[PDB]
Write an enzyme that holds these catalytic residues in place. Structure first.
Site, mmCIF file in Angstrom:
data_model
loop_
_atom_site.group_PDB
_atom_site.id
_atom_site.type_symbol
_atom_site.label_atom_id
_atom_site.label_comp_id
_atom_site.label_asym_id
_atom_site.label_seq_id
_atom_site.Cartn_x
_atom_site.Cartn_y
_atom_site.Cartn_z
ATOM 1 N N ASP C 62 0.844 -1.179 0.000
ATOM 2 C CA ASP C 62 0.000 0.000 0.000
ATOM 3 C C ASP C 62 0.885 1.238 0.000
ATOM 4 O O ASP C 62 1.404 1.631 1.046
ATOM 5 C CB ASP C 62 -0.897 -0.005 1.242
ATOM 6 C CG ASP C 62 -2.010 1.029 1.167
ATOM 7 O OD1 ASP C 62 -1.716 2.244 1.083
ATOM 8 O OD2 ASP C 62 -3.184 0.607 1.200
ATOM 9 N N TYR C 155 -10.969 15.776 -15.525
ATOM 10 C CA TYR C 155 -9.750 15.109 -15.073
ATOM 11 C C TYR C 155 -9.174 15.795 -13.818
ATOM 12 O O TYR C 155 -8.570 15.145 -12.961
ATOM 13 C CB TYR C 155 -8.711 15.003 -16.192
ATOM 14 C CG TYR C 155 -7.685 13.914 -15.966
ATOM 15 C CD1 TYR C 155 -8.074 12.578 -15.716
ATOM 16 C CD2 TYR C 155 -6.322 14.201 -16.012
ATOM 17 C CE1 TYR C 155 -7.123 11.558 -15.524
ATOM 18 C CE2 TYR C 155 -5.362 13.193 -15.807
ATOM 19 C CZ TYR C 155 -5.772 11.883 -15.568
ATOM 20 O OH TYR C 155 -4.808 10.925 -15.373
ATOM 21 N N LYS C 162 -0.784 14.038 -12.048
ATOM 22 C CA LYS C 162 0.014 13.473 -13.131
ATOM 23 C C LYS C 162 1.170 14.414 -13.508
ATOM 24 O O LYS C 162 2.265 13.962 -13.874
ATOM 25 C CB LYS C 162 -0.848 13.144 -14.357
ATOM 26 C CG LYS C 162 -1.756 11.928 -14.209
ATOM 27 C CD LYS C 162 -1.007 10.672 -13.790
ATOM 28 C CE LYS C 162 -1.919 9.456 -13.856
ATOM 29 N NZ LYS C 162 -1.205 8.171 -14.216
#
Ligand SMILES: NC(=O)c1ccc[n+]([C@@H]2O[C@H](COP(=O)([O-])OP(=O)(O)OC[C@H]3O[C@@H](n4cnc5c(N)ncnc54)[C@H](O)[C@@H]3O)[C@@H](O)[C@H]2O)c1
Lengths: 247, 256, 246, 252
Positions: C62, C155, C162
């Site tokens: 994780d 987005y 990103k």
């Protein structure tokens, strides 16, 4: 005005609606001092047009011709001590280049015609106006378009030629820096696919000749002496977005 | 080989050291069948140089001439059913363009030649190869350099002609898109003049070699690359992605 | 294959249709040995899922927990004497970030979480992985999307994350180059919709896969800090159609 | 003055060498009314620095505190009709994030602290101040740095953050343009050998940055949105480093 007393040469003025016009208008307002070039058999058309700007000179310049680019400055030199800015709103490609599939269209001649009038001419101008532009926070600006950065339909050989211009701005920026001359470009948006632009771009509109005109003016002032080699987009934001389809 | 059975045409092969050579070496290893071009009086030099790649043909093509480019494919077509890739490794600028202040050096003629040879020729090959490349996940690749993107001392109008190349590459990507033809370009760092600077700033701390470039042109001509078009891959040891200024080498001298 | 005997860690395999499954299929075909991370109560679904790749290890991870990441490699180091590549295919943004006007949606926490899982976790992986990747032409590849480069409807926060992710790629590239570790990113076009790009199609998981594979191969040892769009040319084109309805 | 009667809010003035000081000078010359933020006990300091611009307001704002930001706009709202621009000149990274190999240094807490203050806070300000800017050709400007685009040594986490900021500027631009708001950024150069590599062979000065930021809040800049404008003596458009030698001379 933030351009008071500065001497600027504006190329590309052809009509009432020319980007070059918005430029002239902004500049005159900021109290610069103005001169204009025409190509071919438009002596008449432009001197009528630019009367309102109280031009120092209206001079022939077909950037096809080297002798004409020389004389342009020899004659400008009879009217001016030196020169503060050159603004470059010149572009052209043959029709055959501009409508269809790009590699169907493109021909050797069109490629070098388009590159010659649209890209080299800028450098050729820098070459011949240089000597009168040294150490005065002198500025040079080109008019460019996103078809340089990104492939589009039917812009074709013109998009390539624009990429060529942009490269040329950067090299000129470096060549002319020692002389303290800034070199930059304004990337306009369209002024029949401005619809797309108006729908997608964040400011929800096409831009106008005044918005571009002011940017070009600002870029020839003492406020912009830290900027060179740069493309400023005056395109309602279109450049920094990537939607696809709209309805 | 991942390029097995593919008929690929290579340009710009002049020596052992040529980028095209690296390209060819790579492409040959991967089972490509290869053709080669030469300019001027190099039929022999180039025939002897590429013998090791068992070429399908060795053909004259000076990219100045429309006739030579048409005759290229008429000839290639005599031996090869159709065509899979074209590797464009061609650069020229008159030396008078390359020595000093860009505005000092640049001429209308220089600019013209530069773009003609370095950029147009790419589209010209696309134009005459297109018919031979229809419907086979076919590929074009061009070679470029960071001077396209950013201004540099000396590189001058070659810097512009490269920007014109990259723009050309993208428009061609759009144009042949319909015909299943991917069109890309590799920006290569310097290959053994300031290699030193490249090798000191770049993350991977080296200059690249022609294999490293060759291998990537290979890939971009493979069925594995068919999702990639209009792209500029830098094979330059990481130079593009970095922003330093002057490094500081420390030269020791011994005086006897 | 060009990945013969290379030992690669792949993250973010959740599905029969994950990009990481395409990557796996590609790398395995190219002769690599592979290891896979799973999250929480998903040990078994990821075990059934990568059986076909004869995995060297299936280990918990994780990327929220430093302890879990340290533990990955401690345990990965027990099976392998060195690491060839890490594949970073991890993305998450809380749902409330992703639907609407960005300035409406965005929250401090969303901004925090998205960056943590989507961007930082790349650096975390480099950081713990580094010592098993030294001097063997090792590789790191992250998955990314053009939403980083340009703003898009919905987005939103993900786009910024990103962006943060592609900077993480660049810095890592610079920070790890000195160990021969090439660090790169693949910007992937979407797999499905439910016209624009020059190839007139959607790239599939193999095309993405084969590029990530090549970017972990010895053929790409001169390529780092780079973004390679596998998106059918979408990045290099600027046509939007308008779609009229009559 | 090309900014006459515009109400603008200036963050990140911590001394008279701050970029925000350049901006303030520029904007006041161009006839804008200005308000200023300050964090912590620095009320007095900041009130002294800016006294000369007749601040329309001097108010606390720690961009870490959601609630401080709300109160910022509640209080500014009592003083002003609406709002024309926000200048964002705020950056922070923990010290441990900036002095070495990026991967050795970088930490979860660092990475997110860095992004919260340096990148999020921009969207955060936009959010709470949006309402005062609705339809008046309003503008937002951020200050960024070229290490968002490229990697430098040790700028590390900050370069990532600044990159994140730059995307935020893009998304904010699209989120807010429907209300006529331009949202841009000035990638300032440092104020050395940026003085040896840049085409213009010099370091840009705060006025050169200030003047640009001012222009980006003028009505002349209404067709420019989501841009990043380099005021860095042209350093960005160039690839111009070279290896500098030091000579060591040993005799016999
Ligand atoms: N019109 C638009 O909506 C739009 C949109 C984006 C960018 N642009 C830019 O507009 C600039 C041109 O201005 P425009 O839009 O007013 O119309 P335009 O592009 O049709 O005009 C081109 C100008 O070039 C001049 N010119 C052409 N060949 C010349 C030569 N050989 N010698 C000297 N001058 C020559 C012409 O007189 C004309 O004024 C171009 O540089 C183009 O990049 C225009």
């Amino acid at each position: 005005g933030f351009l008071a007393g500065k001497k600027i040469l504006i190329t590309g003025l052809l009509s009432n609606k020319s980007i070059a016009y918005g430029i002239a208008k902004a500049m005159h307002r900021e109290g610069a001092e103005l001169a204009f070039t025409y190509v071919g058999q438009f002596k008449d058309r432009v001197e009528k047009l630019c009367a309102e700007f109280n031009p120092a000179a209206v001079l022939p310049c077909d950037v096809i011709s080297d002798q004409e680019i020389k004389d342009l400055f020899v004659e400008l030199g009879k009217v001016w001590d030196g020169l503060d800015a050159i603004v470059h709103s010149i572009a052209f490609a043959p029709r055959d280049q501009l409508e269809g599939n790009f590699i169907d269209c493109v021909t050797r001649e069109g490629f070098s015609i388009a590159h010659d009038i649209s890209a080299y001419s800028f450098a050729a101008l820098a070459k011949e106006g240089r000597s009168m532009m040294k150490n005065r926070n002198a500025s040079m600006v080109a008019l460019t378009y996103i078809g340089a950065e990104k492939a589009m339909p039917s812009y074709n050989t013109m998009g390539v030629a624009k990429a060529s211009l942009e490269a040329t701005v950067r090299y000129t920026a470096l060549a002319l820096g020692e002389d303290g001359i800034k070199v930059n470009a304004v990337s306009a948006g369209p002024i029949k696919m401005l619809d797309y632009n108006a729908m997608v771009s964040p400011l929800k509109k096409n831009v106008d000749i005044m918005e571009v005109g002011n940017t070009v003016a600002f870029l020839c002032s003492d406020m912009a002496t830290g900027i060179t080699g740069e493309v400023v987009h005056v395109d309602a934001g279109y450049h920094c977005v990537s939607m696809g389809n709209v309805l």
